[PDB]
């Protein structure tokens, strides 16, 4: 199980930024750079059916190491590192045997402390792999794709039974596009998992179910000083609808498995407003009468308005909660968290505040949790991650790929 | 008194319209034909010390008729029409012994009616004076230009007794920059008077105290999933700013000399938002109260915020109620009550609610109430005049000049 290590800091490197907003899929040239070398170590390794098409999609096969009726699984990465902030020229940092205190990132007043990240003290002993302060580090999602590598290098060159692993690496996960043109089809797997997952023993296979509610205010301008029973103001009417969803059920007053409304972004003048809503909640019930509030908070402010004066609502579903389909068969998580626990880990299991492609996927016909890859504090300079939790993530999946043949 | 009408088409013939947010004064080239055209007018008049400044204010002096120590007046008009609706290709409709029904506005489906304005019912047996319903009129100011005119002729060509009078063409006027560079000291008139307002009667010189308020809110964004105690939304201070701002005094629910916030427009997303507010009011208290009010409103709103997250509020005043600077002095107002009287026309003082430019001068040494124009529905399509009460215009104020002559 080497080059972990190497093969990430070699992904590192590269600069894999996604940007938002454009129509090209993937949405920049570095992750087609990724794409290539990814392309390029999965022929040298000797993976077969290895694709990589139009839209930037990396697909491969090691096949069967027995035989035996053993259903084909499959492992998901991503190549692109968060827009909101660089990827572009990372220098990792190594601290090796960390022993608690706090971290210089690079020369300059930037630190990674223990008081600010509590978790710190959770990895008494290990190698941390940090940032100079100056960018992101990419452990989300390079860590992932290094750790499926790295299960590759070692399924394939030890004593290990397993029937087909199929892998892949996709483009845009961070601006929505991760699932999008993705071919469960000729991938082929009867169930995968992402490797996007937080620190050692994360395990996900709940998600939020998300839609967005956008509002058009139409009022009615005219001069003020003589606007009396004529001028229908349209931010009044915004402030009066928003003043109408629950404060106490705002992502600023809610945690773990409680849903909520959020107002993203507003504007606009006398004439006209719009507002932009989203709702989150992993019940559907609990989704369903989140959209009815919106609408009858709207119809309530809509009460009489000179009919060229309304407020429309358009609300449109972004994705589903994942549970029901990756929990209707019980192996998928049963063999990951056997897997787990031969492997001396505890399965932590936590709802996802939010979505993933695994999500998307788990409604295209490819049930699909997310597994652990190690890495934390995901998005800024403060992202980190530490080669003991990568290599736990390399053995789990290792693990489930053996368990998977034992019961096949 | 000749030519009023044919001056008054002529100079409706003139695109002259201004425009919003341009540094040069005036900000279209329009205005500088209509400059050009009424200063050849008062050359050929034989006015005195007539100018036009590199800013575009066009003055003269009719000098006094007889001798005595008769104070110096005069009569301001602007030359630019509004941004709201275009005064391109004006073509005029007259109507002769208006008789009541609907107008036609040039072919096509466009009316001026009695039903809509009732105004038109007071009007009968006049001479009403139309747009094809494809542009603005002009009325607004160009009745005012052509009645100054007008009454400069009737001044220098009869019989009748008067001292110097003043007259000025201001350029900017509907984009606020009427009276910035106005020069009162090369005017040199004791006091004067625009002719900017609307029907018969109509003597103004009571106008809004204005101010602005601009609030800008810093807030603290991210990711929803995890924002609890973290995420500070500066939407949601706006909305609760604004849900403290007295719907009752809004423009849509006042009147007449009753003050008001208005709020013109607000933008923002989760970290950052701003509000732009007004407040009118007629009362120099009720107006410092309606400051304090807001700022107390911000305060509330910004209870306790992790100090990178606040509520800036930056109030400027616009302009002032020019009462006090009118009523000072007696004879101003008197003399053109008296001169209405003389006329057989009844005196119609309502309060200014906004301000004019009238307002402006009567801070920089030159007291200056508003005088009639004889025209109607100031920035739309719907805009109209009648003759007769364009000929009323220039009889008030040539008998305000043979009274102020009178008296000196
Ligand atoms: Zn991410
Ligand atoms: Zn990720
Ligand atoms: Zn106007
Ligand atoms: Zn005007």
């Known amino acids: 199980m080497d080059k972990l290590l190497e093969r990430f800091l070699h992904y590192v490197s590269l600069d894999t930024q996604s940007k938002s907003g454009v129509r090209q899929v993937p949405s920049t040239e570095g992750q087609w750079k990724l794409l290539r070398l990814?392309?390029?170590q999965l022929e040298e390794m000797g993976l077969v059916n290895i694709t990589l098409s139009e839209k930037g999609t990396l697909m491969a096969t090691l096949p069967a190491n027995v035989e035996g009726d053993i259903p084909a699984?499959?492992?998901?990465?991503?190549?692109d590192t968060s827009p909101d902030f660089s990827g572009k020229n990372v220098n990792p940092q190594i601290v090796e045997n960390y022993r608690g205190g706090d971290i210089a990132l690079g020369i300059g007043d930037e630190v990674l402390s223990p008081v600010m990240f509590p978790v710190?003290?959770?990895?008494?002993?290990?190698?941390?792999?940090?940032?100079?302060?100056?960018?992101?580090?990419?452990?989300?999602?390079?860590?992932?794709?290094?750790?499926?590598?790295?299960?590759?290098?070692?399924?394939?060159g030890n004593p290990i039974?397993?029937?087909?692993?199929?892998?892949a690496f996709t483009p845009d996960e961070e601006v929505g596009k991760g699932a999008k043109h993705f071919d469960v089809e000729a991938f082929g797997a009867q169930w995968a998992y992402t490797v996007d997952g937080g620190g050692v023993g994360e395990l996900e296979f709940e998600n939020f179910n998300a839609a967005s509610v956008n509002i058009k205010i139409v009022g009615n301008n005219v001069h003020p000083g003589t606007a009396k029973g004529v001028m229908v103001n349209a931010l009044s009417l915004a402030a009066?609808?928003?003043?109408?969803?629950?404060?106490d059920e705002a992502?600023?007053?809610?945690?773990?498995?409680?849903?909520?409304?959020?107002?993203?972004?507003?504007?606009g003048t006398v004439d006209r407003a719009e507002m932009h809503y989203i709702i989150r909640d992993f019940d559907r019930k609990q989704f369903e009468a989140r959209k009815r509030k919106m609408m009858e908070i709207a119809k309530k402010v809509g009460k009489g308005l000179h009919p060229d004066c309304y407020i429309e609502l358009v609300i449109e579903d972004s994705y589903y909660n994942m549970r029901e389909k990756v929990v209707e068969h019980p192996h998928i998580l049963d063999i990951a968290q056997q897997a787990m626990r031969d492997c001396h880990i505890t399965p932590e299991m936590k709802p996802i505040r939010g979505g993933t492609d695994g999500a998307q996927l788990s409604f295209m016909g490819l049930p699909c949790p997310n597994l652990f890859t190690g890495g934390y504090n995901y998005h800024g300079k403060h992202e980190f991650v530490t080669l003991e939790g990568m290599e736990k993530a390399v053995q789990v999946i290792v693990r489930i790929a053996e368990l998977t043949a034992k019961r096949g």
């Not at 699984?73 to 190549?79: A, E, N, R, T, W």
């Not at 960018?135 to 750790?147: C, F, H, S």
């Open 38 to 40: 990814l392309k390029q």
């Open 73 to 79: 699984i499959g492992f998901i990465s991503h190549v």
């Open 120 to 156: 710190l003290h959770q990895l008494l002993g290990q190698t941390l792999i940090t940032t100079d302060g100056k960018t992101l580090l990419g452990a989300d999602d390079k860590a992932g794709v290094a750790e499926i590598m790295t299960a590759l290098a070692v399924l394939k």
């Open 161 to 167: 039974p397993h029937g087909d692993i199929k892998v």
């Open 240 to 247: 009066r609808i928003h003043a109408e969803v629950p404060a």
């Open 251 to 267: 992502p600023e007053t809610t945690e773990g498995y409680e849903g909520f409304y959020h107002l993203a972004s507003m504007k």
